Amino acid sequence: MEYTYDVVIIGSGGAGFSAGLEAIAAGRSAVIIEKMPIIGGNSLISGAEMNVAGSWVQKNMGITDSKELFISDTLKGGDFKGDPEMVKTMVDNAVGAAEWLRDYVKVEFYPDQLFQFGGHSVKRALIPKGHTGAEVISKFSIKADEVGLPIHTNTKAEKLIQDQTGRIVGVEAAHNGKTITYHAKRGVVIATGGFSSNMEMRKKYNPELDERYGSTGHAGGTGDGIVMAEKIHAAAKNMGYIQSYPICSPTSGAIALIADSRFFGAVLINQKGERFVEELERRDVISHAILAQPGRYTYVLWNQDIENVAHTVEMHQGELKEFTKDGLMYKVDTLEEAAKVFNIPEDKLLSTIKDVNHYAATGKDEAFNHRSGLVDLSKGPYWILKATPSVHHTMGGLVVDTRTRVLDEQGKVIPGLFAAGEVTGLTHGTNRLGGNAYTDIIVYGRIAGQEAAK
Amino acid sequence: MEYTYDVVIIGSGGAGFSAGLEAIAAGRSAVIIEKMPIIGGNSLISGAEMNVAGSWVQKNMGITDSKELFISDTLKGGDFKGDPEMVKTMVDNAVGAAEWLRDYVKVEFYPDQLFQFGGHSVKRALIPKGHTGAEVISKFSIKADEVGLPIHTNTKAEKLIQDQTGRIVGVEAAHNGKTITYHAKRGVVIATGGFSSNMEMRKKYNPELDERYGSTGHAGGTGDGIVMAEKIHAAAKNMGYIQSYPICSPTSGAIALIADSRFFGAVLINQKGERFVEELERRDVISHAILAQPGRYTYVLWNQDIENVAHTVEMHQGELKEFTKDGLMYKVDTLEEAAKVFNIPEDKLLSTIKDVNHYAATGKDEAFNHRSGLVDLSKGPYWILKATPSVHHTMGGLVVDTRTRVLDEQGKVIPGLFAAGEVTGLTHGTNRLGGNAYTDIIVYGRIAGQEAAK
Numbered sequence: 001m002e003y004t005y006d007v008v009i010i011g012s013g014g015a016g017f018s019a020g021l022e023a024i025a026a027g028r029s030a031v032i033i034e035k036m037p038i039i040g041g042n043s044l045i046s047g048a049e050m051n052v053a054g055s056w057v058q059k060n061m062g063i064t065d066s067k068e069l070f071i072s073d074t075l076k077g078g079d080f081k082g083d084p085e086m087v088k089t090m091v092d093n094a095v096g097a098a099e100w101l102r103d104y105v106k107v108e109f110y111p112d113q114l115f116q117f118g119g120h121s122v123k124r125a126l127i128p129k130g131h132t133g134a135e136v137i138s139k140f141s142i143k144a145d146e147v148g149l150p151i152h153t154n155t156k157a158e159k160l161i162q163d164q165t166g167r168i169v170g171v172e173a174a175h176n177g178k179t180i181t182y183h184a185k186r187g188v189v190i191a192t193g194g195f196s197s198n199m200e201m202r203k204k205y206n207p208e209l210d211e212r213y214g215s216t217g218h219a220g221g222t223g224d225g226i227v228m229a230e231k232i233h234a235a236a237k238n239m240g241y242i243q244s245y246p247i248c249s250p251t252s253g254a255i256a257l258i259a260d261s262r263f264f265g266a267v268l269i270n271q272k273g274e275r276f277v278e279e280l281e282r283r284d285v286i287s288h289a290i291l292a293q294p295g296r297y298t299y300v301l302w303n304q305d306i307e308n309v310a311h312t313v314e315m316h317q318g319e320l321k322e323f324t325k326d327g328l329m330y331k332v333d334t335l336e337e338a339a340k341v342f343n344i345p346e347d348k349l350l351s352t353i354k355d356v357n358h359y360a361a362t363g364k365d366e367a368f369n370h371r372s373g374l375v376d377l378s379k380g381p382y383w384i385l386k387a388t389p390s391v392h393h394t395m396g397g398l399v400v401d402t403r404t405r406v407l408d409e410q411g412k413v414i415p416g417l418f419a420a421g422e423v424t425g426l427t428h429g430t431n432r433l434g435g436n437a438y439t440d441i442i443v444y445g446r447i448a449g450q451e452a453a454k
Numbered sequence: 455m456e457y458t459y460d461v462v463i464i465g466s467g468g469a470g471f472s473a474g475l476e477a478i479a480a481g482r483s484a485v486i487i488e489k490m491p492i493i494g495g496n497s498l499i500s501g502a503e504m505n506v507a508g509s510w511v512q513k514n515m516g517i518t519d520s521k522e523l524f525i526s527d528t529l530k531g532g533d534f535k536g537d538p539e540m541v542k543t544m545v546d547n548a549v550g551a552a553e554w555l556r557d558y559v560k561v562e563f564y565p566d567q568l569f570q571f572g573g574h575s576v577k578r579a580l581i582p583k584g585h586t587g588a589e590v591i592s593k594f595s596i597k598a599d600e601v602g603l604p605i606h607t608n609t610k611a612e613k614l615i616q617d618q619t620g621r622i623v624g625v626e627a628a629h630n631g632k633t634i635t636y637h638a639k640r641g642v643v644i645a646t647g648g649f650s651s652n653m654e655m656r657k658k659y660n661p662e663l664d665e666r667y668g669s670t671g672h673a674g675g676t677g678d679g680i681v682m683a684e685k686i687h688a689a690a691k692n693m694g695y696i697q698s699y700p701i702c703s704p705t706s707g708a709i710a711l712i713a714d715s716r717f718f719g720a721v722l723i724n725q726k727g728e729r730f731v732e733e734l735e736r737r738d739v740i741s742h743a744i745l746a747q748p749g750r751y752t753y754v755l756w757n758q759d760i761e762n763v764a765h766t767v768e769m770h771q772g773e774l775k776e777f778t779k780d781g782l783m784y785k786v787d788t789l790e791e792a793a794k795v796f797n798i799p800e801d802k803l804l805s806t807i808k809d810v811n812h813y814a815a816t817g818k819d820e821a822f823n824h825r826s827g828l829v830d831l832s833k834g835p836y837w838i839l840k841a842t843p844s845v846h847h848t849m850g851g852l853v854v855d856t857r858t859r860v861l862d863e864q865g866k867v868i869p870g871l872f873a874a875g876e877v878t879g880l881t882h883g884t885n886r887l888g889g890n891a892y893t894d895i896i897v898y899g900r901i902a903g904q905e906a907a908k
């Protein structure tokens with residue numbers, strides 16, 4: 001079996017959907033091939049918070065921002081190793097990308113809530129309805145069906161087809177045990193995501209991130225797009241720069257979005273019943289703090305008063321059920337019971353919380369200088385969750401220009417080949433800031449579809 | 455020639471002076487041996503700002519602090535690698551150490567000024583009169599003369615003398631081309647400082663910090679105390695953790711205390727005439743930002759309005775003269791002349807400063823989010839200084855217990871041997887916070903003299 005389209009996109013995350021919608025809108029034929037039985041990749045299970053300087057939400061909330069500050073925050077976040085033009089193009093197109101999600105894809109964002117991730121000087125992360133990528137992928141899917149963009153699931157790209165001039169002209173993929181050839185008349189877009197779930201590739205480029213760590217990502221995040229492109233001499237860079245997320249399941253590796261109560265007053269308690277890090281410190285600081293605690297894990301503790309403002313339990317009920325079944329989370333009436341279920345010393349926990357309650361009343365955290373203010377924890381019920389860092393995002397990957405064209409080992413454009421999203425390696429330097437992956441995947445996914453369709 | 459004292463102290467910095475005053479006050483005989491012709495080491499040329507949680511100055515200024523916060527700030531600053539008991543003992547004794555400098559040594563501190571170094575949650579660094587260690591060392595010297603503590607300059611310790619039981623019982627030192635034996639009846643205190651000025655030792659433990667970098671320290675900061683102690687099987691740790699300071703002379707390596715105008719509104723301008731980092735970011739962030747700029751240097755620019763509040767020119771006139779003679783600093787009437795002297799593009803500098811002036815008026819730095827507020831730079835005169843990072847402090851060194859006893863490679867106390875100050879390696883983890891070296895050297899210098907005199 002063979003198929004022919006103008007634009008063949010590999011991957012059904014935010015980058016691939018953005019490329020596909022743009023290629024169809026340009027009047028070209030296009031397909032997305034997706035190796036899993038379901039669409040959306042890590043973009044689906046993402047928090048999907050998306051940084052934008054100058055958004056309609058910031059305006060509603062009276063928050064001023066600037067592209068210059070977003071650029072400088074981003075470059076500094078990655079230890080000044082990111083490509084400045086890639087960061088500039090991401091920031092310059094972020095407003096348009098978010099307005100396009102709103103107006104064309106019909107993604108609903110809260111009009112009056114934002115997250116401030118570590119390294120950001122102002123609150124700037126837009127929040128999709130539901131606080132996950134479910135809203136984004138479900139709306140992308142509906143729009144794709146409306147506009148006539150086909151998505152072939154259970155179809156794994158295995159080889160790029162390169163003609164005698166060096167142009168990439170198609171993809172060989174596996175489906176139901178057979179090879180299918182996808183001819184691409186105008187371009188191939190690699191939108192395959194990262195390699196957080198490829199243990200051997202992690203260990204090759206960053207030996208510390210071995211079997212001691214889980215992955216927050218889906219099973220399909222295995223680096224296939226880098227491997228396929230390297231076979232035709234695409235360059236890669238920054239492959240050793242791999243980040244973890246601090247608050248993840250010790251059993252499955254999954255992120256704990258339910259623990260976004262950390263942004264609303266939840267406290268981090270170690271096995272000794274003590275507070276050990278400011279709960280809103282920079283992401284890697286929190287991870288390193290947790291790894292310095294007994295057992296290399298933390299507890300996250302909060303109450304109903306926090307849930308009534310944060311809604312992270314209501315929004316992440318699958319996590320509640322799974323973490324509870326795994327013995328990693330408990331809902332308890334009292335602090336005494338919270339200590340009992342996890343063998344935390346009771347007197348130390350109670351003394352810690354007495355201090356928290358005082359700091360909440362005064363607004364002055366005399367132990368860790370919590371930046372936004374603690375909330376009284378004297379009254380339950382409470383959730384307590386056990387968490388540890390897990391591998392989360394691979395900042396390295398393919399070398400592209402700001403037009404998403406993939407470059408070879410001498411910096412020459414490989415005709416017909418584009419790449420966008422976490423598969424690329426030039427935007428985030430040594431360390432991606434929270435909320436900046438979604439900005440990257442939409443901005444560059446759109447550009448890739450536009451360029452491939454030319 | 456031989457001498458006999460109860461306590462023989464090697465080094466005339468803050469650690470050695472603190473040990474010597476305590477040994478004499480305990481009723482014991484003591485001497486300080488100093489290899490240079492002048493006293494004071496790096497403690498003399500230090501800014502000598504000294505962190506204390508709960509000081510009389512904080513009380514005068516209405517600033518609340520806590521030992522818990524100082525401990526947590528410090529441990530986090532060193533990536534959770536510092537010894538928690540060493541940090542706790544430093545913090546627990548900091549108030550007493552500073553009050554002792556004030557009341558016993560007669561050091562004068564400003565009653566109503568503090569510095570907030572990177573990583574500190576609140577302003578907590580006491581400032582000696584003159585904003586340098588000149589006040590500290592000059593007062594220590596006067597007190598030493600009053601109490602009868604001799605200091606033998608031009609006397610270089612070369613070998614610790616160890617008896618057949620393993621006890622350290624003296625020091626062999628060189629003076630005027632001859633060896634002098636110092637018998638120590640009760641103890642030897644190693645207070646020799648760091649190794650920022652030993653190129654071969656830097657390259658051995660941290661190969662990046664090679665001849666491309668200067669040192670901010672005096673020529674005597676060569677690691678001799680570590681070498682002498684290792685010869686008798688003292689343990690060392692953390693030797694590869696070596697920090698730089700961002701704003702130093704490209705010619706001599708010296709720190710630019712005159713550029714403490716950065717705490718009062720001075721801006722950092724690259725060769726292109728642009729602002730590239732928040733001027734009050736964490737120290738290493740500023741260093742990395744500078745190394746990412748063209749030429750791996752920055753300019754520091756400020757005006758008379760800033761000097762009239764900061765006084766960093768008035769307080770550091772030797773630096774003014776030396777940096778000016780070296781072609782690294784200019785005093786100019788106008789921004790146009792500031793651009794000319796360093797070949798900075800004029801239009802870019804003027805546009806940068808127009809933005810700064812607007813951000814100063816609104817209090818909102820839309821480029822880098824300056825945390826304390828910019829100051830209008832429309833009116834001169836101006837100073838402009840060229841600066842680059844230089845090697846500054848060696849966090850590693852000898853293994854001690856909290857009683858300053860030096861431990862061997864199996865963790866056993868070496869009888870008769872104590873160490874204090876930058877020569878030790880367990881307090882600061884991977885990264886010492888600004889102002890914490892002075893706290894360490896006084897607290898542990900006092901303990902070393904007390905313990906050695908027992």
Ligand SMILES: Cc1cc2nc3c(=O)[nH]c(=O)nc-3n(C[C@H](O)[C@H](O)[C@H](O)COP(=O)(O)OP(=O)(O)OC[C@H]3O[C@@H](n4cnc5c(N)ncnc54)[C@H](O)[C@@H]3O)c2cc1C
Binds near residue numbers: 016042046220255423
């Ligand atoms: C749990 C979680 C939470 C996150 N939260 C946030 C957040 O709030 N904000 C933020 O900015 N970032 C966040 N991130 C990161 C961000 O979600 C991802 O980096 C981004 O969604 C990746 O988008 P993508 O389009 O590059 O790849 P993906 O969304 O991973 O899509 C790639 C797709 O390609 C498919 N594919 C791979 N190989 C092949 C092949 N050989 N053939 C066919 N198909 C293939 C995959 O199966 C997958 O469906 C989060 C990540 C995770 C895992």
Ligand SMILES: Cc1cc2nc3c(=O)[nH]c(=O)nc-3n(C[C@H](O)[C@H](O)[C@H](O)COP(=O)(O)OP(=O)(O)OC[C@H]3O[C@@H](n4cnc5c(N)ncnc54)[C@H](O)[C@@H]3O)c2cc1C
Binds near residue numbers: 465469647671678892
């Ligand atoms: C320019 C500068 C600015 C600084 N600013 C600050 C600041 O504001 N706040 C802060 O907390 N820290 C600061 N630091 C760091 C801090 O000043 C030093 O870490 C601290 O002063 C070192 O004290 P010490 O007693 O361990 O050693 P030193 O003060 O260096 O004294 C050691 C002495 O031992 C002598 N010695 C060495 N080997 C031998 C030998 N073989 N025989 C005899 N004598 C020997 C040396 O010659 C020297 O005089 C600064 C450092 C520098 C260089």
Ligand SMILES: O=C(O)CCc1cnc[nH]1
Binds near residue numbers: 046048260
């Ligand atoms: O990885 C990111 O960009 C943010 C992770 C996240 C945590 N809570 C929501 N999103």
Ligand SMILES: O=C(O)CCc1cnc[nH]1
Binds near residue numbers: 500501711887888889
């Ligand atoms: O190295 C330190 O602890 C601070 C350096 C400093 C800069 N200005 C005054 N002191």
Ligand SMILES: [Cl-]
Binds near residue numbers: 112113115
């Ligand atoms: Cl909000």
Ligand SMILES: [Cl-]
Binds near residue numbers: 119433
């Ligand atoms: Cl961060």
Ligand SMILES: [Cl-]
Binds near residue numbers: 433
């Ligand atoms: Cl974050």
Ligand SMILES: [Cl-]
Binds near residue numbers: 566567568
């Ligand atoms: Cl002050």
Ligand SMILES: [Cl-]
Binds near residue numbers: 572736738887
């Ligand atoms: Cl710092």
Ligand SMILES: [Cl-]
Binds near residue numbers: 571572737887888
């Ligand atoms: Cl600092």
Ligand code: NA
Binds near residue numbers: 395396397425
């Ligand atoms: Na990447």
Ligand code: NA
Binds near residue numbers: 876878
């Ligand atoms: Na040291």
